[PDB]
Amino acid sequence: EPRTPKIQVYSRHPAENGKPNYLNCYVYGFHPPQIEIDLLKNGQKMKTEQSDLSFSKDWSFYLLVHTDFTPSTVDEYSCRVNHSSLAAPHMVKWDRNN
Amino acid sequence: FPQSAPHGV
Amino acid sequence: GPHSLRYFYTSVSRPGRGEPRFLAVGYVDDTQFVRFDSDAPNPKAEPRAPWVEQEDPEYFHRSTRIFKGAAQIDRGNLQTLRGYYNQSEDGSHTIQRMFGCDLGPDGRLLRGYNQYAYDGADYIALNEDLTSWTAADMAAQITKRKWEAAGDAEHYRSYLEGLCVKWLQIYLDKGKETLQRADPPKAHVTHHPVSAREVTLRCWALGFYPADISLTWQRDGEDQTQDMELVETRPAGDGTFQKWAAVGVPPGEEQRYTCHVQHEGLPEPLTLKWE
């Protein structure tokens, strides 16, 4: 029944340790629309903004969750996602090359 | 500019 | 060129947790310009692009009026559908409506849309004749018989051939330096060593609007689509879009590979390589 979300975790611009940037978690292709999406700094929930729920031609939902962040060698960033389609919350690491 | 359906389902 | 006006209605039942919640958003192409949430207190229709903010307050009152209409009609749909499918009052269910119009380059209606899904699946949709419906199954068939009896399509037509095209041209005109000023991608290749055997060459496209783009790799004139890594286009968060396509090539061999970028924002297609 439920469709399982695709997740990318990426910065708005190429990342320079020290330079403020925006951290994005784009989750798409899911159904039903009830979903939990969090950005984590070292596995800790950040203050984020979530976009207005919309869907594509195939009726699957998509959401941009985002925040200001300043990358460092020290800090690990990741996106946590619980949906009905998942056995348990998935966490996707931010890699600056993704 | 939006529109609601005259009738339900 | 070809432009679209689409609304996206989403109503979700919350068994136990009160009445269903209704959400609506309005888009011109890949730019969102309005939203509505039935759960917002004193719930209005809110501008979500700069070029709508310059409309009389009645524009927003009328929309508000219409979304409340849409919210309430759905509250009823949700319960009639439980009936139709003979579902208990226990589980959350979802009704979705996508509708609007497309215009051709000459500014006349090309196509009109009015389609519904139940729990993410095709329920009923207005055919291109703008007169008959395709129902997905036996439940939606009942709706086909009703809406065809009542002659509801005629009212969507009214709106399509009237308001829809009218307000699209209005938005296209009032948002020219966004909606018709097409952003070209700024393209660049990055070099990610994996092993002695392969380097990942990644062709980045950034700052493009609208979202549509072809990102492709060629080794010696020869397309690598079947052999390349390629993320789904993603929002930058500033109204522009991102995409990359990667290929695992033997080191030394980089200059065999040319990345290609097609976007309407480009006067001529970009061919680039590593450096």
Numbering used by the authors:
A (entry chain B): 1 to 98
B (entry chain C): 1 to 9
C (entry chain A): 6 to 280
Give excerpts from the publication.
The MHC-I molecule plays a crucial role in antiviral immunity by presenting antigenic peptides to activate specific CD8+ T cells to clear virus-infected cells, while its downregulation can activate NK cells and trigger inflammatory responses. Bats possess distinctive characteristic in their MHC-I molecule, with prevalent 3- or 5-amino acid (3AA or 5AA) insertions at the N-terminal end of the peptide binding groove (PBG), which may generate a unique antiviral immune response. To explore the influence of the 5AA insertion on the structure and function of bat MHC-I, we focused on Mylu-B*67:01. Mylu-B*67:01 contains the most common 5AA insertion sequence, MQQPW, and also exhibits the D61/R67 pairing.
To examine how the insertion influences the peptide presentation by Mylu-B*67:01, a mutant version of Mylu-B*67:01, named Mylu-B*67:01ΔMQQPW, was created by removing the MQQPW sequence. In vitro refolding experiments demonstrated that this mutant could still bind to the COVID-19th P1-P3 peptides, albeit with slightly reduced complex formation compared to the wild-type HC. The crystal structures of wild-type and mutant P1 peptides in complex with Mylu-B*67:01 and Mylu-B*67:01ΔMQQPW were solved, except pMylu-B*67:01ΔMQQPW-P1-E which may be attributed to by its low thermal stability. The binding patterns of peptides P1-F and P1-T with both Mylu-B*67:01 and the variant Mylu-B*67:01ΔMQQPW remain largely unchanged, with the primary structural variations localized around the region where the MQQPW sequence has been inserted. The structures show that Mylu-B*67:01ΔMQQPW has a classical 310 helix conformation, whereas the insertion of MQQPW introduces a new minor helix and slightly delays the formation of the α1 helix after 61D. In Mylu-B*67:01ΔMQQPW, the 310 helix region is one of the regions with the highest B factors, and in Mylu-B*67:01, the insertion is able to reduce the B factors of neighboring residues. In Mylu-B*67:01, there are a total of 12 intra-chain hydrogen bonds in this region to maintain the structure, whereas in Mylu-B*67:01ΔMQQPW, there are only four hydrogen bonds.
